């Protein structure tokens, strides 16, 4: 197994769960790797873990994200943990086609679930 | 001991597909089996199989059923096989049940999705 994508997983799943969300993971990564809901959000995340300073994703994992988020009725959502710097996470637009992320390219949790701009 | 669940949780898979829904299989069923949303209406579901034509459900069960889907945002829903029959099913209150269910019990998927 890809013992490396597990433990990047692990770590996310309690961060969603800090954040107050109920965190389900998909069978063999079927149509996406997690979902996540807190009440009110539903995220549907496919994540990934990298050494390297940028990531490219392909059309169809970007297009297979796109299209079962929108089926679901969640945000869809790309983590990333770029190793030996962290997670950055990017909602991805509509538009379903190859991409190169970097570090630069993502908000953290935080900015992701709007903490920035709600009161409380 | 885990076949005729594995084989239930499939089959409804594609029952809810092909009403609209988008699902996903817990790995492991730690708090449910499936979690499924079509935009509208989202379900958080516990799948339970049986050859008898009548099962007992406990409360510590549905306990957790609806936490998590509280916690979640989704309706927490039993869906029970009865083998050589059909599938029932009924959203959970959070009020106690510990009660027995049969084929006549609940309501059918179609009258669930309303």
């Known amino acids: 197994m890809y013992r490396k994508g597990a433990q990047a997983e692990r770590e996310l799943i309690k961060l969603l769960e800090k954040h107050g969300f109920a965190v389900v993971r998909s069978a063999g990564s079927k149509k996406v790797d997690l979902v996540a809901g807190?009440?009110?959000?539903?995220?549907?995340?496919?994540?990934?873990?990298?050494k390297k300073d940028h990531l490219y994703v392909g059309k169809r994992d970007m297009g297979r994200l796109?299209?079962?988020?929108?089926?679901?009725?969640?945000?869809?959502?790309?983590?990333?943990?770029?190793?030996?710097?962290?997670?950055?996470?990017?909602?991805?637009?509509?538009?379903?086609?190859?991409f190169v992320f970097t570090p630069s390219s993502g908000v953290s949790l935080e900015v992701l679930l709007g903490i920035q701009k709600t009161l409380e």
């Open 38 to 50: 807190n009440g009110k959000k539903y995220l549907c995340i496919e994540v990934k873990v990298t």
């Open 66 to 98: 796109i299209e079962f988020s929108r089926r679901f009725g969640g945000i869809p959502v790309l983590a990333v943990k770029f190793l030996n710097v962290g997670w950055r996470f990017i909602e991805v637009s509509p538009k379903i086609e190859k």
